[PDB]
């Protein structure tokens with residue numbers, strides 16, 4: 001169950017009963033740049049800190065981002081999280097990511113390269129994401 | 142970077158042994174196989190009894206064959222271009238730790254292939270699953 | 285270039301009426317439907333009783349719905365972006381005989397769609413079937 | 428006798444009086460433009476319409492453009508597969524069937540026009556990573 005919704009600049013987060021946060025929406029009209037440096041934590045109205053463990057379903061859908069850092073607090077990237085981000089060319093994934101859900105980078109056709117962290121256990125076939133993604137690299141543990 | 146020293150036939154498998162001391166699986170001949178499961182040998186012996194590791198699955202080695210399953214042994218470092226392409230009955234692929242490279246379209250248009258597990262040793266993949274309809278999910282082996 | 289005159293609800297269907305005298309189907313609400321077959325009306329009546337043709341299936345109108353089949357009536361000229369995307373039970377699509385354009389990803393990631401018949405009137409399609417990997421064959425009436 | 432060579436083109440001639448283009452040999456071609464002949468003649472001067480582009484006929488060749496003449500009824504499986512420089516395909520007009528992966532990995536192909544005669548084809552969006560739009564001629 002959602003405990004509260006917190007807005008941090010262009011980011012909307014939902015805080016759950018289990019003490020984790022999901023990044024539910026990126027609002028490009030509120031962003032200071034096209035590089036999304038996603039925070040690893042979010043603080044509620046009472047000063048309690050929660051880790052950002054999930055990039056929610058369609059959170060960045062159809063946004064103008066050119067680059068993104070997914071912090072090491074994130075365990076899962078949701079379905080269509082970065083779908084139709086037509087200018088997205090630089091994706092930094094971090095060691096602790098376990099799951100990359102279906103079509104997480106659907107039609108990110110400016111994405112030419114991606115490196116998968118050693119921690120990833122299950123992902124959607126990454127070659128479905130971008131028409132320009134010829135090769136996928138895997139980080140060694 | 143090398144030259145073929147000898148060609149060896151082991152049942153349905155053709156191997157080329159290179160002067161660098163490694164062997165490439167160049168062809169799978171269906172008509173000589175005992176079953177549709179390809180249990181690829183990790184090594185091949187030449188006419189003088191010398192043993193060589195099978196380090197590469199050659200380009201198109203299993204192209205359009207009737208295989209239902211395959212074990213790629215721990216001796217293999219790379220899987221060549223279209224090595225298992227258009228294998229419409231292939232549903233079970235065992236990759237082993239030591240594989241580094243999966244070349245372009247290596248498992249292309251394999252319509253019965255629904256999943257694959259990638260070993261922790263794999264460093265690079267050139268779109269090996271293009272046109273393989275049911276290949277949604279990729280699992281990754283931990284170290 | 286037009287403006288929305290009014291919005292009309294007809295069972296599970298939401299329509300926008302434009303000043304050019306046409307209607308766009310903007311949303312399909314699963315919870316208001318009597319069945320999983322979407323028999324889209326060819327016309328819609330506004331609050332003053334005026335009938336208008338349904339000429340467009342709007343962007344994402346049926347996105348992620350439970351529909352198993354759809355009839356796109358002969359009044360429809362264009363199917364919008366992602367109009368039927370992610371409809372994983374959709375297997376039967378009857379398209380409009382006046383359909384001219386099928387916009388980008390209109391039938392994307394529809395994993396149960398195995399075939400489609402394209403009407404002779406269609407002039408242009410912007411990759412409508414991306415990620416619908418069971419969609420092998422496309423039929424046309426021909427000569 | 429049942430095989431005819433016309434420059435870079437090999438044709439197999441059938442009992443039913445039709446011909447299949449079985450192979451394109453780029454080392455024998457005068458250019459990278461494959462203007463496929465609509466007919467082929469045997470040693471006795473009998474003319475055979477070219478009705479089929481055979482399976483893998485142009486596989487991995489250097490062609491930059493192709494005209495498939497109005498005599499062709501079917502394009503075979505992987506006929507133009509891995510033709511990495513192919514950017515212009517003219518289909519004519521009598522074509523009925525386009526078999527599986529006829530233009531597989533023809534990733535320099537940005538648009539294609541499908542003739543009104545085509546009745547059944549492999550999804551053309553599978554062929555090229557650069558093919559955003561398919562046009563249908565009336």
Ligand SMILES: [Mg+2]
Pocket residue numbers: 250252527
């Ligand atoms: Mg197939």
Ligand SMILES: [Mg+2]
Pocket residue numbers: 117118119138139260261262281282
């Ligand atoms: Mg790994």
Ligand SMILES: [Mg+2]
Pocket residue numbers: 102277393395
């Ligand atoms: Mg799917």
